Design an enzyme around this catalytic site. Sequence first.
Site, PDB file in Angstrom:
ATOM      1  N   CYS A   6       0.985  -0.989  -0.199  1.00  7.50           N
ATOM      2  CA  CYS A   6       0.201  -0.090  -0.531  1.00  7.50           C
ATOM      3  C   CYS A   6       1.221   1.340   0.153  1.00  7.50           C
ATOM      4  CB  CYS A   6      -1.065  -0.099   1.333  1.00  7.50           C
ATOM      5  SG  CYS A   6      -1.775   1.599   0.975  1.00  7.50           S
ATOM      6  N   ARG A  33       0.092   4.569   2.916  1.00  7.25           N
ATOM      7  CA  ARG A  33      -0.243   4.603   3.564  1.00  7.25           C
ATOM      8  C   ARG A  33      -0.160   5.558   4.963  1.00  7.25           C
ATOM      9  NH1 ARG A  33       3.979  -0.412   4.587  1.00  7.25           N
ATOM     10  NH2 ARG A  33       4.219  -0.514   2.462  1.00  7.25           N
ATOM     11  N   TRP A  77      -9.329   6.304  -1.264  1.00  2.66           N
ATOM     12  CA  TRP A  77      -9.785   6.525  -3.081  1.00  2.66           C
ATOM     13  C   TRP A  77      -8.547   6.310  -4.401  1.00  2.66           C
ATOM     14  CZ3 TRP A  77      -8.905   9.706   1.481  1.00  2.66           C
ATOM     15  CH2 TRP A  77      -7.911  10.309   1.625  1.00  2.66           C
ATOM     16  N   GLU A 125      -4.015   3.624 -11.136  1.00  4.87           N
ATOM     17  CA  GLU A 125      -4.955   2.448 -11.073  1.00  4.87           C
ATOM     18  C   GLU A 125      -5.694   2.242 -12.362  1.00  4.87           C
ATOM     19  OE1 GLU A 125      -6.024   0.849  -6.904  1.00  4.87           O
ATOM     20  OE2 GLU A 125      -4.599   2.882  -6.680  1.00  4.87           O
TER      21      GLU A 125
HETATM   22  C1  HEM Z   1      -6.987   6.562   1.266  1.00  7.99           C
HETATM   23  C2  HEM Z   1      -6.188   6.301  -0.020  1.00  7.99           C
HETATM   24  C3  HEM Z   1      -5.355   4.572  -0.111  1.00  7.99           C
HETATM   25  C4  HEM Z   1      -4.859   5.162  -1.233  1.00  7.99           C
HETATM   26  C5  HEM Z   1      -4.432   6.236  -2.139  1.00  7.99           C
HETATM   27  C6  HEM Z   1      -4.744   4.097  -1.934  1.00  7.99           C
HETATM   28  C7  HEM Z   1      -3.544   3.688  -2.636  1.00  7.99           C
HETATM   29  C8  HEM Z   1      -3.172   1.994  -2.976  1.00  7.99           C
HETATM   30  C9  HEM Z   1      -2.743   1.540  -4.468  1.00  7.99           C
HETATM   31  C10 HEM Z   1      -2.279   2.445  -5.259  1.00  7.99           C
HETATM   32  C11 HEM Z   1      -2.308   0.022  -3.531  1.00  7.99           C
HETATM   33  C12 HEM Z   1      -1.587  -0.923  -5.003  1.00  7.99           C
HETATM   34  C13 HEM Z   1      -3.061  -1.997  -5.519  1.00  7.99           C
HETATM   35  C14 HEM Z   1      -3.058  -2.859  -6.724  1.00  7.99           C
HETATM   36  O1  HEM Z   1      -2.642  -2.054  -7.435  1.00  7.99           O
HETATM   37  O2  HEM Z   1      -3.874  -3.353  -7.098  1.00  7.99           O
HETATM   38  C15 HEM Z   1      -2.756   0.046  -2.912  1.00  7.99           C
HETATM   39  C16 HEM Z   1      -2.764  -1.764  -2.226  1.00  7.99           C
HETATM   40  C17 HEM Z   1      -3.129  -1.658  -1.258  1.00  7.99           C
HETATM   41  N1  HEM Z   1      -3.725  -1.044  -0.125  1.00  7.99           N
HETATM   42 FE1  HEM Z   1      -3.907   1.116  -0.291  1.00  7.99          FE
HETATM   43  N2  HEM Z   1      -4.710   2.865  -0.783  1.00  7.99           N
HETATM   44  C18 HEM Z   1      -5.107   3.465   0.553  1.00  7.99           C
HETATM   45  C19 HEM Z   1      -5.635   3.519   1.491  1.00  7.99           C
HETATM   46  C20 HEM Z   1      -6.145   1.856   1.848  1.00  7.99           C
HETATM   47  C21 HEM Z   1      -7.085   1.601   2.899  1.00  7.99           C
HETATM   48  C22 HEM Z   1      -8.320   2.625   3.648  1.00  7.99           C
HETATM   49  C23 HEM Z   1      -6.740   0.220   3.127  1.00  7.99           C
HETATM   50  C24 HEM Z   1      -7.349  -0.894   4.652  1.00  7.99           C
HETATM   51  C25 HEM Z   1      -8.219  -0.164   5.817  1.00  7.99           C
HETATM   52  C26 HEM Z   1      -5.575   0.275   2.765  1.00  7.99           C
HETATM   53  C27 HEM Z   1      -5.369  -1.604   2.192  1.00  7.99           C
HETATM   54  C28 HEM Z   1      -4.647  -1.877   1.053  1.00  7.99           C
HETATM   55  C29 HEM Z   1      -3.782  -3.315   1.419  1.00  7.99           C
HETATM   56  C30 HEM Z   1      -4.417  -4.103   2.152  1.00  7.99           C
HETATM   57  C31 HEM Z   1      -3.093  -3.522   0.029  1.00  7.99           C
HETATM   58  C32 HEM Z   1      -2.418  -4.820  -0.675  1.00  7.99           C
HETATM   59  C33 HEM Z   1      -3.706  -5.562  -1.649  1.00  7.99           C
HETATM   60  C34 HEM Z   1      -3.093  -5.804  -2.090  1.00  7.99           C
HETATM   61  O3  HEM Z   1      -2.151  -6.749  -2.127  1.00  7.99           O
HETATM   62  O4  HEM Z   1      -3.951  -6.749  -3.487  1.00  7.99           O
HETATM   63  N3  HEM Z   1      -4.960   1.027   1.615  1.00  7.99           N
HETATM   64  N4  HEM Z   1      -3.306   1.108  -2.187  1.00  7.99           N
HETATM   65  N1  LIG Z   2      -7.187 -10.941  -9.925  1.00  7.19           N
HETATM   66  C1  LIG Z   2      -6.527 -11.207  -9.242  1.00  7.19           C
HETATM   67  N2  LIG Z   2      -5.477 -10.727  -9.436  1.00  7.19           N
HETATM   68  C2  LIG Z   2      -4.796 -10.771  -7.791  1.00  7.19           C
HETATM   69  C3  LIG Z   2      -4.393 -11.274  -7.036  1.00  7.19           C
HETATM   70  C4  LIG Z   2      -3.965 -10.497  -6.123  1.00  7.19           C
HETATM   71  C5  LIG Z   2      -4.596  -9.097  -5.576  1.00  7.19           C
HETATM   72  C6  LIG Z   2      -4.769  -8.329  -7.041  1.00  7.19           C
HETATM   73  C7  LIG Z   2      -4.832  -6.798  -7.018  1.00  7.19           C
HETATM   74  C8  LIG Z   2      -6.079  -6.032  -6.762  1.00  7.19           C
HETATM   75  N3  LIG Z   2      -6.039  -5.336  -6.047  1.00  7.19           N
HETATM   76  C9  LIG Z   2      -6.964  -4.454  -5.672  1.00  7.19           C
HETATM   77  C10 LIG Z   2      -6.635  -3.327  -5.022  1.00  7.19           C
HETATM   78  C11 LIG Z   2      -6.703  -3.421  -3.776  1.00  7.19           C
HETATM   79  C12 LIG Z   2      -5.962  -2.701  -2.429  1.00  7.19           C
HETATM   80  C13 LIG Z   2      -5.818  -1.083  -2.926  1.00  7.19           C
HETATM   81  C14 LIG Z   2      -6.723  -0.751  -4.568  1.00  7.19           C
HETATM   82  N4  LIG Z   2      -6.282   0.586  -4.488  1.00  7.19           N
HETATM   83  C15 LIG Z   2      -7.134   1.835  -4.210  1.00  7.19           C
HETATM   84  N5  LIG Z   2      -6.869   2.251  -4.190  1.00  7.19           N
HETATM   85  C16 LIG Z   2      -8.138   0.612  -2.728  1.00  7.19           C
HETATM   86  C17 LIG Z   2      -8.500   0.343  -2.185  1.00  7.19           C
HETATM   87  C18 LIG Z   2      -9.157  -0.290  -1.011  1.00  7.19           C
HETATM   88  C19 LIG Z   2      -8.812   1.146  -0.633  1.00  7.19           C
HETATM   89  O1  LIG Z   2      -7.945   1.518  -1.655  1.00  7.19           O
HETATM   90  C20 LIG Z   2      -7.842  -1.789  -4.664  1.00  7.19           C
HETATM   91  C21 LIG Z   2      -5.077  -9.093  -7.882  1.00  7.19           C
HETATM   92  C22 LIG Z   2      -6.731 -13.080  -9.588  1.00  7.19           C
HETATM   93  C23 LIG Z   2      -7.049 -13.877  -8.709  1.00  7.19           C
HETATM   94  C24 LIG Z   2      -7.288 -14.966  -9.527  1.00  7.19           C
HETATM   95  C25 LIG Z   2      -7.716 -14.821 -10.449  1.00  7.19           C
HETATM   96  O2  LIG Z   2      -7.257 -13.321 -10.549  1.00  7.19           O
HETATM   97 CL   LIG Z   3      -9.483  -1.055  -8.922  1.00  7.29          CL
END
Ligand code: HEM
Ligand SMILES: N=C(Nc1cccc(CCNCc2cccc(NC(=N)c3ccco3)c2)c1)c1ccco1
Ligand SMILES: [Cl-]
Lengths: 403, 402
Positions: free
Chosen positions: B106, B109, B278, B283
């Site tokens: 993330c 953070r 947000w 993304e």
């Molecule tokens: C507030 C503005 C926030 C921004 C700009 C942001 C931005 C991002 C971005 C760009 C990613 C990469 C996701 C991807 O490439 O698919 C990410 C991942 C992640 N975010 Fe943040 N995020 C925000 C808030 C949060 C919040 C509120 C939470 C949880 C309470 C959170 C938990 C996570 C987690 C667990 C991941 C890892 C997702 C994964 O491994 O698929 N984020 N964030």
């Molecule tokens: N789709 C697959 N791959 C895949 C696996 C693991 C992870 C991913 C990446 C998908 N993260 C979605 C994601 C996670 C966390 C943050 C944000 N963005 C934000 N800004 C946000 C959201 C909330 C607060 O902030 C977007 C893709 C899959 C699994 C099985 C077949 O395909």
């Molecule tokens: Cl998305």
Amino acid sequence: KFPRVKNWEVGSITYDTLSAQAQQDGPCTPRRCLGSLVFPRAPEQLLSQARDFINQYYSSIKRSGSQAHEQRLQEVEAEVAATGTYQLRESELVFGAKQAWRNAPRCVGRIQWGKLQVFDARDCRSAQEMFTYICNHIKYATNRGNLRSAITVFPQRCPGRGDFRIWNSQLVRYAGYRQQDGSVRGDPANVEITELCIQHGWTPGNGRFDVLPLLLQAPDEPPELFLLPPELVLEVPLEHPTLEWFAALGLRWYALPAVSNMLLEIGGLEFPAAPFSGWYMSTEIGTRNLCDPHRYNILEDVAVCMDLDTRTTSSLWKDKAAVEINVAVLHSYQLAKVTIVDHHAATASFMKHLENEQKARGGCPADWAWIVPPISGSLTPVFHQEMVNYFLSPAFRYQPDPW
Amino acid sequence: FPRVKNWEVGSITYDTLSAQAQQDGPCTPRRCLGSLVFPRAPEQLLSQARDFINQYYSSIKRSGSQAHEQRLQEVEAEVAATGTYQLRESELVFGAKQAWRNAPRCVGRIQWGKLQVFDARDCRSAQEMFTYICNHIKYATNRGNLRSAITVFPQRCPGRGDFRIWNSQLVRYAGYRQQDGSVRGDPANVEITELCIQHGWTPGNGRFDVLPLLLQAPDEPPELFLLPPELVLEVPLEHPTLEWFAALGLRWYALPAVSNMLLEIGGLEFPAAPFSGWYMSTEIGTRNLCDPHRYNILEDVAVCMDLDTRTTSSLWKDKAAVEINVAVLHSYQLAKVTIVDHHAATASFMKHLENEQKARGGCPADWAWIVPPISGSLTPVFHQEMVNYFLSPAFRYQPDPW
Ligand code: HEM
Ligand SMILES: N=C(Nc1cccc(CCNCc2cccc(NC(=N)c3ccco3)c2)c1)c1ccco1
Ligand SMILES: [Cl-]
Ligand code: HEM
Ligand SMILES: N=C(Nc1cccc(CCNCc2cccc(NC(=N)c3ccco3)c2)c1)c1ccco1
Ligand SMILES: C[C@H](O)[C@H](O)[C@H]1CNc2nc(N)[nH]c(=O)c2N1
Ligand SMILES: C[C@H](O)[C@H](O)[C@H]1CNc2nc(N)[nH]c(=O)c2N1
Ligand SMILES: [Ca+2]
Ligand SMILES: [Cl-]
Ligand SMILES: [Gd]
Ligand SMILES: [Gd]
Ligand SMILES: [Gd]
Ligand SMILES: [Zn+2]
């Protein structure tokens, strides 16, 4: 026991069985990953590395288990017993240099690894002769702009005698003159080597693109200064195909990337001086060398000239200026007929390499952070390719700076 | 303690927090698997529960006090009485914030201290699940002034099934298999699109048909719920100077609300705990719209910009990608919907790294996911060495319910 490896664009899956042969340990543990770090840092230990290398050679020519294979193992073993070391055959030196390139995890250009000109300089005896070998290398590799990959390998390290060393990090480097007001005129990556050149008697220039002299170290001698003949050093003036003011920035880069400070290790023998060269991927020049804040750092000046709004990040002026600087690099090298590859073609060829290597050896050591280009990462296919990083031998290795 | 260098500035820190890594990552001294997406008992519970309570009380400076001893004993008795235990509401809040703060991938953070926690641990059915989720979406959207929030549904426990949100996000565009092999809509969502259809959803036929929610209460099958359109804020995409960009009909939604990860706190597991923040503009404009396996619109845009697409070296892919990201930023700002560009966001993560070095001696970070997917080395994080490790509380991936 074998890592599953997925391409997320295609969905395809392989297993890297080759990593199980990793011959030296990296910096990660189950507790924490250090893959993003830049520096991840006799008798029958030499013998086991040597036997492994000879096994690799005889496998490459499809003569494993042959009479000649056994005899060469015995020959190596007897020479290590008598002398504590051994000599490669000429054919083994060529194979080992190509294998070290093939094994380099951070090289995106390894589709080419079988095409490498190997200059054997193991009989080199002096710093003067070193210079001759290097000039012949630059002439051969440059080839008036039609670049050819080459490596020159100077004598191996041996006990009771100092190493051959090239102190410069590359054969062609621009001077970086430290300024009293903190700053630098020229390339800041080359500040230290510039000061060593002056200390050893070089009269410095005062330009931004002054080619450095070479500091060449023969065994047990202090480095000696050698000036490269200007007509040996092919350079490209930078202009842009549609931004005509770009030419007035007075930018330039050199044709030939010839890395000279790494150590080549083959079958447990070590070659501290073995410069190698190929050709540039354009992001190296256009993105890192010209736009890194700690290098030439021209991004803001170009954006101002493009009449971009540099007061807000969200206009993406940085991205737009960087893209055009890369365009200028590609256009200028093509106009000058100097080989160059853009990051799209280079990463597409690496994907073909990965598939070749999966067939040939069951995997490929690759460092994702270094294979993905510094602009447009997810626009290239390697971004979506999972990779396994590990250390095979023969290898190119970092080594301490000799001063 | 690993040494950590920043190569733009030359500064050196030491990560002392990594020594407290709770679990094991996929790497070994033989080989690094850092680029892989998926890194492949009453006593067990008590041990994790004790560590977390100790974390909590140290962080409020009631370290070893009488309130600390009493809570430890309650947890002990509750697990012996029932096999599990119940978090206090303040512990739940602290646990959700820490799980975000610990998330290595993330980049956002810097905001970790600002999180609205909705306690839904008394939820009873999928209908009530839908109500909690609609309240979450309403609150977090806030007419475009997005606010970070998480809703925590009941933990798993033995003998009973889990609550699950079958959709990977609360807002997803349908992906329609076509009779010519292609996909209309979002290819990422072809599977959940078919699951919705299978459970009796009347399909659309657009590229941006918002999916219904497949919500699953324990042991009964999932039920389809339709999101009220006025609840789903969307942004039509336009470009500040390319007047034809609007006519491509592109759009995206305001609220990124991830609904398929598992929240782990003190050894308790919450398989349904949707969280939202947000978007970072890359993304949407790079990954969602330009990935070859997503909307894959890069060549469409380049043709409209009359770029030379027959040679890679004109950098037509790079120029079109940048203008799509420009259109995203412009369209969100024009619509007054919160968004952050990749320069501002990575600059803020650098500050977060500095604050975390002081707060607890380091910060787990996944370099490959922190560095943006365009203009990598134009951002400060590219030149920053990072250490990746797993702390708890945590957000974890989990198998799909089917
Ligand atoms: C507030 C503005 C926030 C921004 C700009 C942001 C931005 C991002 C971005 C760009 C990613 C990469 C996701 C991807 O490439 O698919 C990410 C991942 C992640 N975010 Fe943040 N995020 C925000 C808030 C949060 C919040 C509120 C939470 C949880 C309470 C959170 C938990 C996570 C987690 C667990 C991941 C890892 C997702 C994964 O491994 O698929 N984020 N964030
Ligand atoms: N789709 C697959 N791959 C895949 C696996 C693991 C992870 C991913 C990446 C998908 N993260 C979605 C994601 C996670 C966390 C943050 C944000 N963005 C934000 N800004 C946000 C959201 C909330 C607060 O902030 C977007 C893709 C899959 C699994 C099985 C077949 O395909
Ligand atoms: Cl998305
Ligand atoms: C033929 C065209 C070639 C291209 C386009 C190419 C491309 C690249 C690039 C872009 C890098 C990363 C450099 C950096 O970011 O600093 C790299 C690294 C490397 N290349 Fe290649 N390369 C080529 C040929 C060669 C040859 C001929 C050799 C040796 C025989 C070689 C060995 C290496 C090694 C060992 C590294 C890692 C260097 C380090 O860690 O600093 N490459 N290559
Ligand atoms: N940053 C530092 N050193 C540093 C450390 C690790 C890595 C680097 C990065 C420097 N790679 C140079 C390099 C290596 C290999 C290939 C190419 N390019 C080619 N196309 C090519 C050349 C030959 C064939 O193909 C360029 C630099 C440092 C130390 C003290 C202050 O700064
Ligand atoms: C910290 C990080 O590892 C460092 O900046 C790396 C990232 N990837 C790289 N990749 C290449 N090709 N060259 C580099 O110098 C770097 N630098
Ligand atoms: C194979 C590689 O790990 C995969 O493509 C990663 C790379 N970095 C990423 N970075 C972010 N922010 N999001 C991602 O989905 C990915 N995908
Ligand atoms: Ca001999
Ligand atoms: Cl270079
Ligand atoms: Gd012009
Ligand atoms: Gd037109
Ligand atoms: Gd085509
Ligand atoms: Zn690792």
